[PDB]
């Protein structure tokens, strides 16, 4: 509720009014402090969601994502204070302002009690990210990249706007509790499909499914490090949160209309993971891997099965923490080599031995190696999907088989092998990069002991 | 460059015997068959028709490409062998050692002092050895990858650093 | 047909610098100069005890290195496991489920005392 919001927004005057060089320090202090307070919100009751007021409420689904976003907030500050050191204090302050303003919106939307209120800051997250990708992005095609990312989501979000207000004029309020209790069987009338399509496509776009995913490779690669993590670790997941919330009034229409997306997602994950097997760009390879994992959640959410929701929430968080880490891996390597081609800097393990380890559990976590939370996600989803149909395991398991090859492919090409002779600027890794990397992996294994925290309201 | 015929025959002679060794295995057979294999080689040494010599080496390796042992014998250190770049993962470039923390550098004072001499030597030698390069570079770029030595006294041969300071083949 | 004299000289110096460089890759009797190392009361006591060198010292050296290895790696871990098993795991039902101890015809039990009946006489098969 408020105990998270005002501390987040009151953090903004601090960064603006802090000393010239202390900006990174005091921002990091209370961002971690905010994370601690958010963790206090992680508690949930049995069945009734933790409701605070007409404006804000939390459930067993929102809380794990809330603590994840606040937990993220220190990490971009940690990950960004290397390529922004040679910048004017105002621009550094502006950069920090963008992140916490972005993070502030995330707390708002996840705790939003009204769908329209959920909707207003659903796209409002775009404005800070658009600035981050465009201004501080370090590339040339970032301009076209920002346009692709911006227009795709709007093209899907605006139908939701017309759909959402239609609910208000037809079924009174759009309070999440009032929708759930007063749910009615959506008919099969040919208007209700376009009703169904509008209420779904908005979350489809910013949850890249095959076909509606070309923004993500352009979104991730040209975005700066902080932009890439926030976009891949939370931003691809507003779509996820919407579906678990909005599919309450899409049944039984979801039963019949689910087919085109399920085939698109299940086949897409094989295709996308195949792209990972032959990606020339390390950041792009990680980006395409996010599509495969996210497309798995598409099948998870859209099956509408108790087990499927549970594994979704497991992959909901685990992928986000993992994808942020892998982007950190690529970023921590990038500036040393000043290039994105994977084969540019081979045999890094012989030069940097600890990064060899950090890359190693990172690849293992993305492998869904048990008992990592990723395995709990994928394995739960497979069982739910298998109950839905026996055939899907052929597609399901094949993804894990492909996921194995490309995951260690980056490991062998970069970490193992012969070091590149020509390069000589690879310095011993700063303990900031090392500290940040453990900041990611350590909570992941810490979460393994308590899956019930992140299983969700279906748990 | 020009893979002239005599080197090809020597290529044929050397590699075929290695394959023949992989076949006979036993030393007496290997020695016995090598001599007859040798004997059938030098007996046709009088051919003013080099084209005929080429024709004699059409069926030559074709029989070899049939007669080749599917698992030839290679010492492990060579390509394909079991110990191929086995100790590569240990060898690390010397320039990475410049990164070493001063306390680590203090652990090896005199050797690091010797590094300073090498760093000093390679500095002025570079300009000297590069200067020798342009003044004797053949026109139209380098024609052969072979690198000319240090003509005058005192100066080191050009581009000597990486070859000389190459990590040893058994680094541990 | 054997190197040309210039490249023969090139390999000559390349050899010579390599020998000097390989010579320069050595160590020294003092090297490596490690710093002072923190020591505790117990170890140098063992050092001065073992300085005599005769087998009387070493036989009980191995047993002591085996003693404290037994206590802090076998004795302690089994202690906490038993406490965990006896008062936490077994405190919950159906956590440590045995098999019924197989009982045979003519074998008595101690819980209720009686001996279950013997087997009935075989049809006398002999080889």
């Amino acid at each position: 509720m408020l105990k998270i919001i005002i501390p987040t927004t009151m953090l903004l005057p601090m960064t603006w009014m802090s000393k010239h060089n202390m900006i990174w320090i005091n921002a990091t202090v209370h961002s971690l402090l905010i994370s601690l307070i958010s963790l206090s919100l992680l508690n949930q009751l049995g069945e009734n969601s933790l409701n605070f007021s007409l404006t804000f409420f939390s459930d067993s689904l929102s809380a794990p994502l809330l603590v994840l976003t606040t937990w993220l907030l220190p990490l971009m500050l940690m990950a960004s204070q290397s390529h922004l050191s040679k910048e004017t204090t105002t621009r550094k302050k502006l950069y920090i302002t963008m992140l916490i303003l972005l993070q502030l919106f995330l707390i708002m939307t996840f705790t939003a009690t009204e769908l329209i209120l959920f909707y207003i800051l659903f796209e409002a997250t775009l404005v800070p990210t658009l600035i981050i990708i465009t201004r501080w992005g370090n590339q040339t095609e970032r301009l076209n990249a920002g346009l692709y990312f911006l227009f795709y989501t709007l093209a899907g979000s605006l139908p939701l706007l017309v759909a959402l207000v239609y609910i208000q004029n037809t079924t009174g309020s759009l309070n999440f509790l009032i929708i759930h209790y007063w749910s009615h069987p959506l008919s099969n009338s040919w208007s209700n499909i376009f009703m169904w399509l509008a209420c779904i496509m908005a979350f489809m776009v910013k949850m890249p499914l095959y076909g509606l995913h070309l923004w993500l490779p352009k979104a991730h690669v040209e975005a700066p490090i902080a932009g890439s993590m926030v976009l891949a670790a939370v931003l691809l997941k507003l779509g996820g949160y919407g579906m678990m919330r909005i599919t309450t009034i899409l049944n039984p229409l979801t039963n019949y209309m689910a087919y085109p997306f399920l085939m698109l997602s299940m086949w897409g994950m094989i295709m996308t993971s195949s792209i990972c097997l032959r990606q020339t760009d390390l950041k792009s390879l990680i980006a395409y891997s996010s599509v495969s994992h996210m497309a798995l959640v598409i099948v998870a959410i859209m099956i509408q099965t108790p087990w499927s929701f549970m594994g979704a929430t497991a992959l909901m968080i685990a992928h986000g923490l993992t994808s942020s880490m892998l982007f950190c891996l690529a970023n921590t390597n990038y500036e040393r080599v000043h290039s994105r081609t994977m084969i540019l800097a081979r045999g890094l393990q012989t030069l940097l031995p600890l990064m060899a380890t950090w890359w190693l559990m990172a690849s293992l976590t993305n492998l869904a190696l048990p008992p990592s939370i990723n395995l709990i996600g994928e394995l739960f989803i497979i069982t739910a999907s298998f109950s839905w149909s026996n055939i899907t395991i052929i597609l399901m398991g094949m993804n894990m088989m492909i996921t194995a090859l490309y995951s260690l492919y980056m490991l062998i090409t970069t970490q193992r092998g012969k070091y590149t002779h020509h390069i000589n600027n690879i310095k011993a890794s700063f303990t900031r990069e090392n500290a940040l990397m453990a900041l990611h992996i350590l909570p992941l294994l810490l979460l393994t002991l308590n899956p019930k925290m992140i299983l969700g309201p279906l748990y | 460059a020009y893979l002239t015929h005599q080197q090809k025959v020597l290529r044929l002679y050397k590699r075929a015997l290695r394959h023949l060794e992989s076949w006979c295995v036993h030393r007496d057979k290997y020695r016995y068959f090598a001599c007859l294999m040798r004997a059938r080689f030098d007996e046709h040494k009088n051919e003013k028709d080099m084209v005929k010599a080429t024709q004699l080496l059409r069926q030559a390796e074709e029989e070899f490409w049939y007669g080749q042992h599917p698992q030839p014998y290679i010492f492990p250190e060579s390509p394909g062998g079991t110990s191929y770049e086995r100790y590569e993962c240990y060898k690390v470039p010397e320039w990475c050692l410049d990164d070493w923390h001063p306390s680590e550098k203090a652990m090896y004072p005199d050797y690091f002092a010797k590094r300073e001499q090498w760093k000093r030597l390679r500095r002025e030698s570079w300009e000297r050895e590069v200067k020798q390069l342009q003044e004797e570079t053949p026109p139209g770029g380098p024609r052969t990858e072979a690198l000319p030595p240090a003509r005058k006294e005192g100066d080191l041969p050009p581009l000597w650093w990486h070859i000389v300071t190459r990590p040893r083949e058994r680094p541990m | 047909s054997g190197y040309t004299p210039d490249e023969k000289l090139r390999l000559q110096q390349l050899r010579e610098l390599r020998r000097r460089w390989l010579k320069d890759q050595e160590l020294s009797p003092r090297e490596p100069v490690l710093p002072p190392r923190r020591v505790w009361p117990m170890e140098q006591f063992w050092n001065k005890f073992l300085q005599d060198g005769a087998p009387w010292k070493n036989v009980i050296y191995k047993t002591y290195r085996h003693s404290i290895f037994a206590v802090t790696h076998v004795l302690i871990p089994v202690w906490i496991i038993h406490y965990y098993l006896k008062y936490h795991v077994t405190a919950k039902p159906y956590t440590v489920v045995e098999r019924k101890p197989r009982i045979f015809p003519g074998d008595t039990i101690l819980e209720t005392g009686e001996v279950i009946p013997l087997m009935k006489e075989f049809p006398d098969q002999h080889h």
Partner: peptide
């Protein structure tokens, strides 16, 4: 004999 072994700095 004994000769210097090269190794990336593990101090950090």
């Amino acid at each position: 004999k004994r000769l210097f072994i090269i190794k990336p700095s593990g101090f950090y």
